[PDB]
Amino acid sequence: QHRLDEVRREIELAERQYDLNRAAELRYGELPKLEAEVEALSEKLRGARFVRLEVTEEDIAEIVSRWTGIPVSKLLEGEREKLLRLEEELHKRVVGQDEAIRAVADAIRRARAGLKDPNRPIGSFLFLGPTGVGKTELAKTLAATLFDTEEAMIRI
Amino acid sequence: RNTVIILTSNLGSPLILEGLQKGWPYERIRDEVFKVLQQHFRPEFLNRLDEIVVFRPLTKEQIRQIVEIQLSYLRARL
């Protein structure tokens, strides 16, 4: 990797002095091997009982979780997976009011997927009905389940 | 563009409840309730709403179900 890097500065430095000479053997011959050498060793570690040269989502999600909350979601769930189980997740905290969940869920799904004007909120609703039977709860739960946190709520 | 806008109100509450006691068709309720709305909200508004969701009263069972989920935190904290 260090060579390949040095070799990149190397080449570029030639495509300035016009010394096509050097720049030649570098871009063709040098860079080729080095690029295969590293890609060779990389692959040479596709299996490592004590190593992983790879940096992945989990790794990212983790350091991200370190600054926020639960990699279980930050990571794992992808918008797609999340939006499909949406009605489930919501019901884990909001009892009944099925009509509400579906509507909100469908609206949001209909929102992503790109079937609505991009210049609008993901979804807008008007909750009607009795008091203390779901409304604010659903609003809270939505914030959490959809945005991985009840901190994503803003009340007026 | 990345926000969800929820708006609450009790404008149709009474009528909605009434529609549930007299047990008349949901559609009859929604329409009856909408009219009321048309009296306190500019159509431009009601028309730009993705949905007009109607929450209803809870059933003894649900209430118990809520008790359960409510107990969860206690279980957890304990």
Place this chain on the structure above:
Amino acid sequence: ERWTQAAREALAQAQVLAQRMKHQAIDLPHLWAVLLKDERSLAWRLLEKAGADPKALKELQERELARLPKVEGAEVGQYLTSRLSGALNRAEGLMEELKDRYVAVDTLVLALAEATPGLPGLEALKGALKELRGGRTVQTEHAESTYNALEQYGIDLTRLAAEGKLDPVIGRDEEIRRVIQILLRRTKNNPVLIGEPGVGKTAIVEGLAQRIVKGDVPEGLKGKRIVSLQMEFEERLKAVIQEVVQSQGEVILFIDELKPALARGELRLIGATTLDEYREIEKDPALERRFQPVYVDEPTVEETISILRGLKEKYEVHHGVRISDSAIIAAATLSHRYITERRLPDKAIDLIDEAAARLRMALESAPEEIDALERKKLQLEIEREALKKEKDPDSQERLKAIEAEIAKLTEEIAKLRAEWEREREILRKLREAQHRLDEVRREIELAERQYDLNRAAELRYGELPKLEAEVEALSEKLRGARFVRLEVTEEDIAEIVSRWTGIPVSKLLEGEREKLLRLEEELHKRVVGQDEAIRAVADAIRRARAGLKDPNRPIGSFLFLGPTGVGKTELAKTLAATLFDTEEAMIRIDMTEYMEKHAVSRLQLTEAVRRRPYSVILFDEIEKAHPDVFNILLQILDDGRLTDSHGRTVDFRNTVIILTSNLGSPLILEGLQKGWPYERIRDEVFKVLQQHFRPEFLNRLDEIVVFRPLTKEQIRQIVEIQLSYLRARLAEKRISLELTEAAKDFLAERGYDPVFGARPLRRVIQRELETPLAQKILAGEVKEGDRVQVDVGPAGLVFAVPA
């Protein structure tokens, strides 16, 4: 003409002073009094730097003036004392002894310094004056002496106007004349220009400036000088104001945006500000002695067009391009019709100026393409270097494809780089021609101001002729040049305009004429059925333009009657879009809500209209409104204007007023069931109307359109046009959406409702089609480019990709 404007003005100053104090002989004390205004005054500087303290001089000099006789009428400022005249003529002898082509104010101080016993002699004085290192043999119309407060913080417009520096202001004779008039008033001589930003208030002032320099202005202003002040601060401000008063009204001050020198009746001022900003000024009885307001109204498109044509020259010269008249008209029209922010004069120009700017940014068109091939060349140029060293002699030496490319590129490069030089050069001369072609028009006008028609003829002949054609050949030489930073056209304008709105295809192309003729088509592209309504509305509008109706009324006023959700609001919306290139041109008034302090809550209406003259105004449930509103409304239908809270009326002549109501709906429906004659319905329904609406109202309505229920097929047609967007939306993902007639029929079915109309269709299409389709897209079942097939079946619609 003979002495510099500086000294020249100094003399006039002294003369006017003589008059003010009612003197007979314009003596030295007068000249001193005006020359020694501030510490900054040149006469003061030069004198203090020589030895004699100016203050004592001025002090003692005014003493003499105070010890002079009070004459009368024809004896005031009757003549020049022998001493003064002598000094004045001695000043000329001193200018020749210095090489100054004219008599400046400093050379004038020496002369007087000689005619005044007690202060420094030539030797000392010439040395001090000399302590300003040359530059006095310059021009006569401007010696450029930056010493005094006025010259320090003020621009002398009359000066620029003198040297043809000001832009040709055209089309505001009335406002200028009014300003002139006001300055002559004894009671209120300080005119303030009240107008909106961009209207051209300052233009008025500089326009007046030019007239003064041409003697186009009456007496009393004939020699005046207009100075524009431009925003310890007050320390210098006072130094300025107190210096204008010492000029003795011979200098008018112009503030683009105090009382002691004013109320005293010695500070002649010209203002300019907003309406409301001036209203506050109208709260100081001592000041608000009525600065003689002069409301400069925003020019019409035609006027704006003339103005643009005026500066046409300047712009294309100061920027080196060619602004076609076509583009000019566009800048005026398009702005006045779709630019809600600024007001005409300004915005139109900004458009022309801003559309051209892009041509300047369009200079880096060569390097980009030249270097684009350069790098691309080095790519293959270095690639060969590797194929030259062969391990495969008769397999690698077949790089004749790459080598050939280098040549071509070496060709294209040598081409464009040299070809570019043409454009660049052709421009070189052109810009020079436009400059001399200007220096000539300046020279000529000059002559035509001093009867030296000698030059005015030799130039206007042959000379001028050349440039005009030379700077005409050079332009014709830059046809479709690779670097066209010349012609500015409609497309260019329309584009920058579209950048602030939408679709040049219409903004541009579409001419009111073409648009008004296809009106019924366009409307039907979005509104299904209700043919009677479209026709009526369309004909009313067409009848409106063409000029067959009172100019003082809205373009068209209507009352939509009939069922609900069958066209009314849609037509209203569609109209706004099709007629005003945007649904943003709509303004709704949900009357069913304004049931309280209504009147007050709309002078809101006036504002929307105020910012968007061309717009459709929709009043829902008109019957629910209270008599109060009908007045504001009725006032719109008549005279097509309206007075808001503040006062400044808003223009409604360019609006379309649609009013809805369900007053006859039931009867209308009944008439359709019992299938009785349309005329029988209309008449029956009209009676009802006559019971809730004042005849004055019903009579001032261009049409009383009646919407009717939709037919099964109409719905389907709506379903189709409704699907259009979904499609145009799914298009962004190359996803096609073909539905079965069965499917469409299903939506039509579920979509329409007897009492609600086609309102439900949307919710239906959303749930029955969009919701499912969304799940498929997120789930991945529907990918990019797929052609989604939709058909009916049990439990609702079913989808199918390909298969």
Place this chain on the structure above:
Amino acid sequence: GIDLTRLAAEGKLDPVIGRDEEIRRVIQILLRRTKNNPVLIGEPGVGKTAIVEGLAQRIVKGDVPEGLKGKRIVSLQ
């Protein structure tokens, strides 16, 4: 001051990517007689400096038009 055009020359600066407009815009303003001193206005972390050092790299590559072709950018600290 740190010579960015030099760090670019030696290939020390990291690859700025995806900001053609802004750069070109600056390239422009850096040639306008009236106002030739362009100021980058933006929130912290958006990549303002990148724009500059990005421009630096172009100069060293001749990727920049004429009039800046040989220029040297120095960052005062």
Place this chain on the structure above:
Amino acid sequence: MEFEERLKAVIQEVVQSQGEVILFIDELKPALARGELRLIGATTLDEY
């Protein structure tokens, strides 16, 4: 912690160690902008 005379003598001596020596300032900037000198700090919030 002529003052800077010795300070520089220190900072320039840590860099010559080649990152093999970490400097710890309990409660400099220049030789930190260009890119060099591995440092570990510690302070109150406001300062930072």
